[PDB]
Amino acid sequence: HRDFTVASPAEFVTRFGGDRVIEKVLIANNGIAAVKCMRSIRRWAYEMFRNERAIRFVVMVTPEDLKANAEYIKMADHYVPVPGGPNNNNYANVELIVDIAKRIPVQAVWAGWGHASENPKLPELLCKNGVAFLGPPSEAMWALGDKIASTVVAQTLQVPTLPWSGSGLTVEWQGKRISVPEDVYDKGCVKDVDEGLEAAERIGFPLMIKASEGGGGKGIRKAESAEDFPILFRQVQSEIPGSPIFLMKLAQHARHLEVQILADQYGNAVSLFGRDCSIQRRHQKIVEEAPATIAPLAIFEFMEQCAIRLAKTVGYVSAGTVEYLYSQDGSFHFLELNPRLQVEHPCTEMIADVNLPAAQLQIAMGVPLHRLKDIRLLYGESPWGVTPISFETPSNPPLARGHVIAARITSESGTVQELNFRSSKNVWGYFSVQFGHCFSWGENREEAISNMVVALKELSIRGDFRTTVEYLINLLETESFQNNDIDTGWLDYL
């Protein structure tokens, strides 16, 4: 019997075509992100080195999480105390993270989602001090910029986009990642109420007035008429001053689909199917599905291809998501590209058998996509083979394994509680103390749903969930959700 394990991270990098050894990782985050990052990487560590602690971890702990005794702390290999208060004093402080990374020192940083995970200055400052980043490089995040820029790129690449203040704008597109000239970029923005109304009448009402630097429920405003446009447009300016402002047509109740991207540092990028997150309660992803079956496989594949084209163009690395908008008819529109891993990634992991955080790690050590066992198996190749893989036209087009249903849940020492169910064996979850997520797997969509409903029912018994998870059960049981109707209007009168 042949041995597939290796001595150290050192041998692994050498034997798997990597070009960098990462054996110490700093996690700039807490809660479920921290836990999930470690649980995923250690599972992989045990498989590859027969040693769960092969890759060391160092966490950041605030006076809050420390007194509350977070599970991630005792889980980590080392923890460093940081100032409490809002995240700008800790988890979100790029100058602090880089600083700690340097002194320990670690060879890489994982930020997951939230906080500074979408701040290009982190991968930039880390790279400047020889510290890897388990995410896209600054050059790729910059080359993508905000919604204005990324949408121009989308159009330059001929990916449909919703009517907006910059519709039609494109750039003239061997290496070298795309760039949007400051002058073209300025053509998608509206400087005053004057040209605002101008563009408005062209996009038609209702529309959204959004600041590019907006987010977090700020710098956004919905205008349904020219009469209110002015006040609202000035309201945005007052909220996020100096910020570039743009307008965009309001999506008329359509589906929200996402493509899961995964790229190495060699121009290779693959799609790991997608997720359907149309069910939402006031700007919150309530129920999510994987893969996305609502749309025709032929059409979703095309969305994968554009997602990959966009990723390749901005020279993306690691994992990220490309959000689309699918319409009842057959049309779809690019919305944005999240340059980070999202909390609902387990869905994909479960249907594509790909350990994402472990993949992010290996890619950061410089391992090509075709040398990642999870991908080789996904493509029907040998677990440890070395042969190249034609991703464009594979000899064994991957197929999703089953169906996953994920639900976001709420309550009636510790920051992250692991949820287990005696009822369903294909369901697992957690809870952060507020919100949490439950993940249900099934041979088919029907089975995935049944399991979720039983796990959710098993939840109702818990006092903290004797009510809050009642609407999810009703929703999952509605004939509408069961038949997977295209229209999502029924949610309102539930």
Curated annotation (Swiss-Prot):
Localization in the cell: Mitochondrion
Binding, Mn(2+) 1: E323, E336
UniProt domain Biotin carboxylation: residue ranges: 21-494
Expressing tissues: Widely expressed with highest levels in heart, skeletal muscle, liver, adipose tissue, mammary gland, adrenal gland and colon. Isoform 3 is expressed in skeletal muscle, adipose tissue and liver (at protein level). Isoform 3 is detected at high levels in adipose tissue with lower levels in heart, liver, skeletal muscle and testis.
Record-annotated active site: R340
UniProt: ATP binding residues: G214, G215, G216, G217, K218, G219
Binding residues for Mn(2+) 2: E336, N338
Domain ATP-grasp: start-end pairs: 174-365
Residue numbers carrying Phosphothreonine: T488
Documented applications: Inhibition of ACACB may prevent lipid-induced insulin resistance and type 2 diabetes, making the enzyme a potential pharmaceutical target for treatment of obesity and type 2 diabetes.
PTM summary: The biotin cofactor is covalently attached to the central biotinyl-binding domain and is required for the catalytic activity. Required for the maintenance of skeletal muscle lipid and glucose homeostasis.
Residues the record lists as binding Mg(2+) 1: E323, E336
Modification Phosphoserine occurs at: S225
Binding site for Mg(2+) 2: E336, N338
Role, per record: Mitochondrial enzyme that catalyzes the carboxylation of acetyl-CoA to malonyl-CoA and plays a central role in fatty acid metabolism. Catalyzes a 2 steps reaction starting with the ATP-dependent carboxylation of the biotin carried by the biotin carboxyl carrier (BCC) domain followed by the transfer of the carboxyl group from carboxylated biotin to acetyl-CoA. Through the production of malonyl-CoA that allosterically inhibits carnitine palmitoyltransferase 1 at the mitochondria, negatively regulates fatty acid oxidation.
Quaternary structure (record): Monomer, homodimer, and homotetramer. Forms filamentous polymers. Interacts with MID1IP1; interaction with MID1IP1 promotes oligomerization and increases its activity in a citrate-dependent manner.
Record text about domains: Consists of an N-terminal biotin carboxylation/carboxylase (BC) domain that catalyzes the ATP-dependent transient carboxylation of the biotin covalently attached to the central biotinyl-binding/biotin carboxyl carrier (BCC) domain. The C-terminal carboxyl transferase (CT) domain catalyzes the transfer of the carboxyl group from carboxylated biotin to acetyl-CoA to produce malonyl-CoA.
Record-given protein name: Acetyl-CoA carboxylase 2
